[PDB]
Amino acid sequence: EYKGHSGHPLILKQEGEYKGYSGEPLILKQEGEYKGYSGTPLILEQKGEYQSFSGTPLILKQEGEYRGFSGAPLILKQDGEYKSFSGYPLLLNI
Amino acid sequence: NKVWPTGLTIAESEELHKHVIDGTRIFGAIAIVAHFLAYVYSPWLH
Amino acid sequence: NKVWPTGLTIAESEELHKHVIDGTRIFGAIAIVAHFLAYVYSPWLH
Amino acid sequence: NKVWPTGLTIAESEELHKHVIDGTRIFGAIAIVAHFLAYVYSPWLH
Amino acid sequence: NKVWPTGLTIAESEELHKHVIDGTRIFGAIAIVAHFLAYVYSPWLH
Amino acid sequence: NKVWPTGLTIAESEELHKHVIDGTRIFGAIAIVAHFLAYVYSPWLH
Amino acid sequence: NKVWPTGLTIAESEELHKHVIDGTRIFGAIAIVAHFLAYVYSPWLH
Amino acid sequence: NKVWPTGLTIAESEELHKHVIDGTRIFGAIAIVAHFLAYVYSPWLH
Amino acid sequence: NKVWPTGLTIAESEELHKHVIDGTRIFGAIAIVAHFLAYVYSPWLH
Amino acid sequence: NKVWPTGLTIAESEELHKHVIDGTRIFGAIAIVAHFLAYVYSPWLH
Amino acid sequence: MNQGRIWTVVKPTVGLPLLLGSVTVIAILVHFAVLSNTTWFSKYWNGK
Amino acid sequence: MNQGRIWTVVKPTVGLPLLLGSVTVIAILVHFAVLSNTTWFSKYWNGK
Amino acid sequence: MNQGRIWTVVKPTVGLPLLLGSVTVIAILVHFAVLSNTTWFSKYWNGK
Amino acid sequence: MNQGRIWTVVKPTVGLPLLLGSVTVIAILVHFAVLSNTTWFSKYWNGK
Amino acid sequence: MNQGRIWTVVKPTVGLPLLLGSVTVIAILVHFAVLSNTTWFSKYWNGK
Amino acid sequence: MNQGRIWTVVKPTVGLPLLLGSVTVIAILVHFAVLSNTTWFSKYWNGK
Amino acid sequence: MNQGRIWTVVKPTVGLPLLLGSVTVIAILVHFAVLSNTTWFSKYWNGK
Amino acid sequence: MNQGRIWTVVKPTVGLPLLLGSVTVIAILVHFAVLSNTTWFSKYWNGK
Amino acid sequence: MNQGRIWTVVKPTVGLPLLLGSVTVIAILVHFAVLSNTTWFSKYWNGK
Ligand code: BCL
Ligand code: BCL
Ligand code: BCL
Ligand code: BCL
Ligand code: BCL
Ligand code: BCL
Ligand SMILES: CC(C)=CCC/C(C)=C/C=C/C(C)=C/C=C/C(C)=C/C=C/C=C(C)/C=C/C=C(C)/C=C/C=C(\C)CCCC(C)(C)O
Ligand SMILES: CC(C)=CCC/C(C)=C/C=C/C(C)=C/C=C/C(C)=C/C=C/C=C(C)/C=C/C=C(C)/C=C/C=C(\C)CCCC(C)(C)O
Ligand SMILES: CC(C)=CCC/C(C)=C/C=C/C(C)=C/C=C/C(C)=C/C=C/C=C(C)/C=C/C=C(C)/C=C/C=C(\C)CCCC(C)(C)O
Ligand SMILES: CC(C)=CCC/C(C)=C/C=C/C(C)=C/C=C/C(C)=C/C=C/C=C(C)/C=C/C=C(C)/C=C/C=C(\C)CCCC(C)(C)O
Ligand SMILES: CC(C)=CCC/C(C)=C/C=C/C(C)=C/C=C/C(C)=C/C=C/C=C(C)/C=C/C=C(C)/C=C/C=C(\C)CCCC(C)(C)O
């Protein structure tokens, strides 16, 4: 057991439950659904697909290779080795 | 329904969001009162 | 389809992004009104 | 009941939140007195 | 082909980078217009 | 009793907190002396 | 050959560094031009 | 005795803290000399 | 020999450090020239 | 002897710290000469 | 009131601290802004 | 509006907080910018 | 007193340090604000 | 357009948020640069 | 004194370094505050 | 052109974002340096 | 000398670096404080 | 040339980025130092 | 030369980077201090 220098007690301890100093209650019970204070409703229940605001369409599907809006091509392919754009060699080796 | 990657179900998330909106409405209510006091007792619009 | 490394399928990802776009369109709508008010009541374009 | 993702039950969480509220009410009580002292010994409203 | 350490195959990486390049070219297009407007309506080169 | 999520029992937590309070009381006493010395030599209240 | 702690072979690392070096040579080439433009149009050495 | 969550026994912890105490004393001894030299050569109390 | 906690043998570590030595020597050899040019073309020692 | 929580033995730790000691001696030995040159060439004590 | 599923994909251990925190950081920044850029709020503390 | 696959590779736990955050940080910065560099916004708070 | 379930989803190992820490940081900031923007609190330390 | 393999070795969870983020930060900094170092941009906001 | 169960839910490996560290940081801040905003503490070092 | 094996021991998930990010940060700093320390770059934006 | 058991609940891998580090940070800050607020220390370097 | 074993106990995934990064950060700081505290380097950019 | 067991409880992967780094950060701060507070070092670079 710790003695301590600043006298005794060093702590308070309680048998069954926390007893507050700032009176009672310390908390409110909630038996069921959230009994909100700022009226109702508190949420809109989405049953199906997203019933968006701000009109429709809301996304554009992709059905294959990506159609770039800035034209084509979007990529340069690679085959067998890296084709340098600044001459050779690129690496030395041990 | 399934537990999503956060570990909540959809129903648990919707019950959680009831707190976030009720809290936000409480914060809005206090702030609107605070702005009314700040209007009456400052030159802001005055 | 498979779950990708984030744990979402493509269909779940698309249903998420619907919220991001609708959120941005609501943000954009409020911002346009805010700019109209800031035009009417400030020297910005006067 | 189940342990939620934090490892607390609802009862252990609510018993914990008693501490957070009691601490807040103690902090609020001291702050009300500290504002009264600052009102007496400063020109703030005076 | 194998999944590389990021969890994408090569073909999945190529399909991703097509988005990054297209997004960059859209950003470039908007920037050219924004600089042209700034050229017309500022003393920058003017 | 059970080990709680931190790896301490309730008894081990209370034994630890006796050190935290003893340290706080030692610090408070040492601080009170230094405020007295500051009051004696500085113009603070003087 | 063995995978090293980063998850790459030597040959995969060396192929990776071919990209890194080429990326610096492209950056270097653009920079030499941008300095020459600055020499022509700024007083830097002029 | 048991290894605690840090992986030290009480005896290993105490044998460690002897180094911290004796290290703090050597710091204190060296610092006191530096305050004395500073008092001799600076106008601090002088 | 064993892999040490970093995953390298002593021989692999010493082969790595040769790159760090020679990388430092290259950086030093460039820096001596950069200082010599600064001595010729600036009033530093001049 | 055992591997400690860092993964080193005591002997591996002490053979390491000989590098930290001798490294600090070399840093100190250079710093003395750097201070001597600063004393000779600057108004510091001079 | 549509986003109630967000906590299925944004973990409350980060979403709720960042929400409550940043709302407070905004309030701090607005107070510093009105304080630094007005006379009457600066005077209100100086009193009399 | 065609990028909605992005959440297959960017985790919403980082994506949405960084999105909602940095958009708010930009809004704060634009208010500070106009506040620091205009008379009319500063005067609007100063009132009278 | 209505929110006591929050610790089922916000981990105390972060939510309690951040609550106690930020409440302290707010107090530090209000002190530095009133110190920097008032005569009397500056004078109070300077004494006489 | 050569580097489409990069996401085999740079994880998009870090790659894309940094790419979108730092570009936005650079945009902010260039606005602050031109705002601080020009009369006309500041005068544009000040109006009149 | 009632709070001695806090270490059942806040890990000492973080709570103690943050408690000791932040107390030291608060001390440093109060010294820098009084040092910057008083003559006598500044003059106490300048000597004579 | 000797260091091609560095990515066997430095992980590209960190080393590439730091290489690209820091070179960008260095470039931003050199622009802010020349902007702050020259008349003409400040004048160039101010125009006329 | 009572706290010999602190390293049972604070890990030495953090506690010793934080101790040695922050002590050094405090020393730096105290030197900068005396340097910024005294003539004699500034003059001690300026020489003659 | 005696420390060749340091990478058995310092992990190259951090020690190589920290070495190369900080050596660059040092060079940035020395340039900003000589720039801010000399006429000739400030003038070198300004021309003439 | 008595502490050589510290690496049984502080991991070299953090202790050695923190040592070599902070020793350098200290050296930088000392140089900035002597630079900002002495004429002769400021003049040493200006040369002539
Ligand atoms: C000498 C200064 C020591 C100290 C030594 C002792 C001793 C010795 C005793 C206590 C005891 C007590 N201590 Mg202690 N204690 C100190 C700091 C504190 C502080 C604080 C600073 O906030 C508090 C709240 C307490 C709390 C308490 C009570 C629980 C209890 C008083 C019961 C009693 O009989 O009452 C009537 C009160 C008294 C007889 C004495 C009260 C002393 C007060 C609390 C000291 C305050 C500090 C003082 C202004 C500055 C001292 C500077 C130092 C000399 C450097 N200690 C410091 C570290 N404390 C007593 C106990 O356990 O009784 C059962 C006891 O025997
Ligand atoms: C004053 C010292 C303690 C305190 C001690 C008590 C005691 C003792 C009691 C309560 C009671 C109540 N307290 Mg408490 N309480 C404090 C702080 C607070 C604060 C706060 C923001 O500071 C709040 C909102 C509460 C909340 C409440 C309710 C849960 C409860 C019923 C009130 C009512 O309608 O009752 C009917 C009562 C009244 C109309 C008046 C009650 C006034 C209480 C005693 C003081 C309230 C704070 C005071 C106005 C401001 C601070 C004073 C300065 C510290 C000097 N406590 C502080 C920390 N509290 C009561 C209770 O549990 O009843 C069953 C009760 O008797
Ligand atoms: C302290 C008062 C409570 C409050 C108490 C109630 C009550 C009581 C009711 C609602 C109801 C409603 N509330 Mg509520 N509500 C508050 C805050 C809000 C805020 C907000 C941004 O602050 C919003 C958008 C809402 C939203 C709504 C709707 C979902 C619903 C219908 C409103 C209506 O026109 O009803 C018709 C008109 C009214 C009921 C009059 C008051 C409504 C307005 C919106 C409240 C404004 C409060 C004002 C800004 C702050 C005053 C604070 C002072 C401390 C008193 N609440 C605050 C926190 N709310 C109603 C409901 O459920 O209907 C089915 C209902 O009966
Ligand atoms: C009430 C304000 C709502 C809104 C409510 C609606 C409604 C209602 C409709 C759409 C429809 C559309 N919306 Mg919407 N929408 C808003 C904000 C946006 C924004 C944006 C950046 O702010 C965009 C890009 C879109 C996108 C679109 C398209 C997918 C679609 C056809 C547009 C068109 O050419 O309409 C041409 C014009 C019309 C059809 C009539 C006017 C409809 C409203 C006003 C939207 C016009 C677009 C314009 C940019 C909005 C500015 C609003 C002001 C800020 C107040 N919405 C806000 C949040 N939207 C339409 C749809 O889906 O049809 C099947 C539709 O009827
Ligand atoms: C409408 C503006 C669209 C756009 C729509 C198109 C269309 C439509 C086409 C391309 C095609 C091409 N685009 Mg694109 N593209 C844009 C932005 C870009 C940018 C950029 C930095 O902004 C780049 C580098 C590219 C790159 C390219 C090439 C890969 C390709 C062949 C160009 C050529 O010589 O065509 C030679 C010319 C033609 C066939 C017809 C005219 C097309 C002109 C030359 C497009 C010029 C765009 C200009 C560089 C950037 C935008 C200016 C602003 C809108 C003000 N796009 C934006 C987002 N792009 C073309 C293609 O696939 O060719 C096989 C094509 O037809
Ligand atoms: C816009 C031009 C391209 C470019 C296109 C080419 C081409 C085309 C070739 C090389 C080849 C070479 N390139 Mg390259 N290269 C560029 C950028 C660089 C840079 C750099 C820092 O910018 C460097 C160091 C290199 C390095 C090299 C060498 C490995 C090699 C010539 C060795 C030699 O002397 O052979 C002996 C000499 C020769 C064969 C002929 C002269 C080659 C000269 C020296 C290349 C000079 C490039 C010049 C500095 C770039 C100007 C950039 C701006 C447009 C101003 N390249 C840029 C991005 N490179 C060569 C090769 O692959 O050889 C097998 C080759 O033919
Ligand atoms: C700089 C200048 C000059 C100017 C700056 C101008 C400027 C930009 C201003 C911007 C302002 C903005 C943007 C303001 C935004 C304000 C907002 C968004 C407020 C939100 C408040 C939210 C609250 C109060 C949340 C409470 C949550 C709560 C209580 C949650 C409780 C959860 C529980 C109990 C768990 C339940 C678990 C189980 C279900 C299992 O039971
Ligand atoms: C400095 C100066 C002078 C000037 C600076 C100038 C300058 C640079 C300005 C720059 C400005 C910029 C760039 C502005 C950009 C603005 C943007 C992009 C706004 C975006 C808003 C996004 C929103 C609102 C998103 C809401 C998401 C939402 C609601 C998501 C909900 C998700 C859910 C519910 C999960 C569902 C899960 C399941 C599917 C399973 O159900
Ligand atoms: C800058 C300018 C000019 C202006 C700025 C203006 C401005 C914005 C001001 C803003 C001010 C604000 C917002 C103030 C907010 C103050 C608040 C919210 C105070 C809260 C205090 C909370 C406390 C004290 C909590 C103690 C918790 C405790 C002790 C918890 C103990 C837990 C235990 C024991 C575990 C049990 C485990 C088990 C055994 C059950 O299992
Ligand atoms: C402030 C003042 C006054 C003064 C300060 C002065 C000062 C200090 C200045 C310092 C300046 C310095 C130091 C400048 C240094 C510049 C450097 C070094 C630039 C480097 C650029 C590198 C690039 C562009 C790399 C691209 C890599 C790339 C794209 C890599 C792609 C990889 C892929 C596709 C994966 C392949 C996967 C598989 C192998 C399977 O195929
Ligand atoms: C503020 C004022 C006024 C003044 C401030 C004054 C002040 C304080 C100045 C201080 C200056 C200092 C301290 C400067 C220090 C500079 C130093 C130390 C430079 C070091 C450079 C090191 C380099 C370049 C390393 C390259 C490594 C490399 C390339 C490594 C390659 C590795 C590979 C390939 C892996 C192999 C794996 C395998 C296959 C073997 O398994």
Task: Report DSSP letters for C4-45, one per residue.
Answer: -TTS--HHHHHHHHHHHHHHHHHHHHHHHHHHHHHHHTSSTT
Amino acid at C9: T
Cα–Cα distance, D2 to C30 (Å, whole number): 43
Q: Are S28 and R29 in contact (CB under 8 A)?
A: yes
Angle at A78 between CA A77 and CA A82, to 5 degrees: 140
Q: Smallest Cα–Cα separation from B5: which of L16, K17, K8, L12?
A: K8
The tokens describing I9, both together, are 């043998």
Contacts 24+ apart (CB under 8 A), B23-29: B23/M3, B25/A38, B26/A37, B26/A38, B27/K23, B29/A38
Buried b (16+ CB within 10 A) or exposed e, I4-27: bbbbbeeebbbebbeebeebeeee
Q: Are O40 and M47 in contact (CB under 8 A)?
A: yes
Pocket mutation for ligand 11, best pick of I19, I21, I32, I35 (most atoms within 8 Å of C-beta): I19
**Nearest CB to Q3 within list H12, H17, H27:** H17
Residues of chain P contacting I23 with CB distance shorter than 8 Å: 3
Which ligand minimizes its atom distance to the CA of F24? 1
Q: What resolution does the deposited structure have, in angstroms?
A: 3.6
CB atoms within 10 A of CB A14: 10
The tokens describing N19, both together, are 């790419």
CA E20 to chain centre: 6
Chains contacting B with at least 3 CB pairs below 8 Å? A, K, L, M
Provide the 8-state DSSP code for H45. T
Strands (E), S1-48: none
Chains contacting D with at least 3 CB pairs below 8 Å? A, K, M, O
* L11/chain N closest Cα distance in angstroms: 7
Measured from the CB, is residue G25 less than 6 Å from ligand 10? no
Q: Which atom of ligand 1 is nearest to F26's Cα?
A: 58
CA A48 to chain centre: 23
I6: which residues sit within 8 A by CB, 6+ positions away?
I13, R7, R8, R9, R10, R11, R12, S13
Torsion-angle region of N10 (φ positive above 0: left; ψ -120 to 50: alpha; else: beta): beta
Q: Smallest Cα–Cα separation from R36: which of S28, P25, P37?
A: P37
Point out which residues pair with A81 in neighbouring strands. A79
Dihedral sign for Cα atoms in the order F11, F14, F19, F20: positive
Tell me if H5 and Q4 make a contact (CB, 8 A cut-off): no
The tokens describing Q24, both together, are 């050094």
The tokens describing F19, both together, are 């050190």
Cα–Cα distance, F13 to B33 (Å, whole number): 44
Pocket mutation for ligand 11, best pick of I18, I25, I27, I30 (most atoms within 8 Å of C-beta): I27
Cα–Cα distance, Q38 to S37 (Å, whole number): 11
Peptide bond into P17 cis (omega under 30): no
**What three-state secondary structure class fits Q27?**
helix
Dihedral sign for Cα atoms in the order D1, D5, D8, D14: negative
Residue of M nearest to O17 (CA): M17
* Helices and strands (H, E) in chain S, number of each type: 2, 0
SS (H, E, C) chain J: CCCCCCCCCHHHHHHHHHHHHHHHHHHHHHHHHHHHHHHHHCCCCC
Identify residues of O whose CB sits under 8 angstroms from chain Q CBs.
Answer: 12-13, 16-17, 21, 24, 28, 31-32, 35, 42, 45-47
In whole angstroms, how large is the CA radius of gyration of chain Q?
A: 18
H or E element: which one contains L32?
Answer: helix L12-36
* Helices and strands (H, E) in chain G, number of each type: 1, 0
Residue of P nearest to E46 (CA): P48
A residues 1..60 contacting L (CB < 8 A): 57-60
Residue of N nearest to A84 (CA): N2
Peptide bond into F43 cis (omega under 30): no
**Nearest CB to G8 within list P7, P19, P41:** P7
Q: Are M10 and K18 in contact (CB under 8 A)?
A: no
Query: Which residue's structure tokens are 């058991």?
Result: Q5
Pocket mutation for ligand 8, best pick of C10, C18, C24 (most atoms within 8 Å of C-beta): C24
Residues of chain G contacting A85 with CB distance shorter than 8 Å: 22, 26
Tell me if Q34 and O45 make a contact (CB, 8 A cut-off): yes
Tell me if D16 and O3 make a contact (CB, 8 A cut-off): no
Task: Identify the burial level of N24 via C-beta atoms within 10 angstroms of its C-beta, where 0-12 means exposed, 13-18 middle and 19 or more buried.
Answer: middle
Cα–Cα distance, K39 to L45 (Å, whole number): 9
SS (H, E, C) chain A: CCCCCCCCCCCCCCCCCCCCCCCCCCCCCCCCCCCCCCCCCCCCCCCCCCCCCCCCCCCCCCCCCCCCCCCCCCCCCCECECCCCCCCCCCCCC
The tokens describing J36, both together, are 């001597």
Cα–Cα distance, I35 to I43 (Å, whole number): 12
Tell me if A85 and N2 make a contact (CB, 8 A cut-off): yes
Residue of C nearest to N44 (CA): C44
Ligand 1 cavity residues, CB under 6 Å: A 5-9; F 25-26, 28-30, 32-33
Cα–Cα distance, S11 to S28 (Å, whole number): 26
The tokens describing H10, both together, are 């009480």
Q: Are Q41 and S33 in contact (CB under 8 A)?
A: no
Tell me whether D34 touches chain O (CB under 8 Å): no
The values of phi and psi at residue A79, to 5°, are: -150, 115
Give binding residues of E for a bacteriochlorophyll as ranges: 17, 35
The Å distance, Cα C31 to ligand 7 centre, comes to: 20
Cα–Cα distance, I8 to I16 (Å, whole number): 10
Q: Which atom of ligand 7 is nearest to B20's Cα?
A: 27
Which ligand minimizes its atom distance to the CA of P37? 10
The values of phi and psi at residue A81, to 5°, are: -160, 165
Q: Smallest Cα–Cα separation from Q35: which of H42, H37, O37, R33?
A: H42
Residues of chain Q contacting F8 with CB distance shorter than 8 Å: 9
The Å distance, Cα A74 to ligand 6 centre, comes to: 26
Cα–Cα distance, P2 to I15 (Å, whole number): 13
In whole angstroms, how large is the CA radius of gyration of chain I?
A: 18
CB atoms within 10 A of CB L4: 21
The tokens describing E21, both together, are 């390049």
Query: Which residue's structure tokens are 């911290």?
Result: H20
Peptide bond into J43 cis (omega under 30): no
Q: Are K35 and K41 in contact (CB under 8 A)?
A: yes
Closest residue by CA, ligand 11 atom 26: I23
Closest residue by CA, ligand 1 atom 20: F25
Which ligand minimizes its atom distance to the CA of G24? 10
Tell me whether S46 touches chain I (CB under 8 Å): yes
H or E element: which one contains B12?
Answer: helix B10-40
Angle between helices L12-36 and C10-40 (to 10 degrees): 10
Tell me if A75 and E14 make a contact (CB, 8 A cut-off): yes
Cα–Cα distance, Q29 to Q23 (Å, whole number): 10
The Å distance, Cα I44 to ligand 3 centre, comes to: 74
Task: Identify the burial level of J14 via C-beta atoms within 10 angstroms of its C-beta, where 0-12 means exposed, 13-18 middle and 19 or more buried.
Answer: middle
Q: Could you tell me how many CB contacts below 8 A there are between chain A and chain P? A: 8
Peptide bond into D43 cis (omega under 30): no
CA N47 to chain centre: 26
Peptide bond into G43 cis (omega under 30): no
Residue of P nearest to N22 (CA): P21
Tell me if K2 and C19 make a contact (CB, 8 A cut-off): yes
* J19/chain R closest Cα distance in angstroms: 8
Measured from the CB, is residue A44 less than 6 Å from ligand 3? no
The tokens describing S21, both together, are 């780094």
The Å distance, Cα G24 to ligand 10 centre, comes to: 6
Tell me if I43 and S13 make a contact (CB, 8 A cut-off): no
CB atoms within 10 A of CB S29: 13
Residue of L nearest to E12 (CA): L9
The tokens describing D40, both together, are 């007496």
Peptide bond into Q12 cis (omega under 30): no
Q: Smallest Cα–Cα separation from D16: which of M3, A1, A9, I33?
A: M3
**What three-state secondary structure class fits N9?**
coil
Contacts 24+ apart (CB under 8 A), H19-28: H19/S3, H19/S6, H20/Q16, H20/Q19, H21/Q1, H23/S3, H27/Q23
Q: Are L9 and N12 in contact (CB under 8 A)?
A: yes
* Helices and strands (H, E) in chain Q, number of each type: 2, 0
H-L interface (Cβ pairs under 8 Å ≥ 3): no
The values of phi and psi at residue F26, to 5°, are: -60, -45
**CA torsion angle B23 B29 B30 B31 (round to 10):** 100
Query: Which residue's structure tokens are 């990069």?
Result: N6
Q: Smallest Cα–Cα separation from N2: which of A84, G15, A92, G31?
A: A84
Cα–Cα distance, M10 to P27 (Å, whole number): 42
Amino acid at Q1: M
Cα–Cα distance, K40 to A64 (Å, whole number): 63
Query: Which residue's structure tokens are 């934090």?
Result: D6
Q: Which atom of ligand 5 is nearest to A74's Cα?
A: 29
Residues of chain O contacting H45 with CB distance shorter than 8 Å: 47
Residues of chain F contacting O23 with CB distance shorter than 8 Å: 27
Q: Which atom of ligand 4 is nearest to C26's Cα?
A: 58
CB atoms within 10 A of CB G22: 19
- Alpha helix segments (H runs only) across N1-48: 12-36, 39-46
Cα–Cα distance, N20 to N13 (Å, whole number): 12
Angle at A60 between CA A55 and CA A64, to 5 degrees: 165
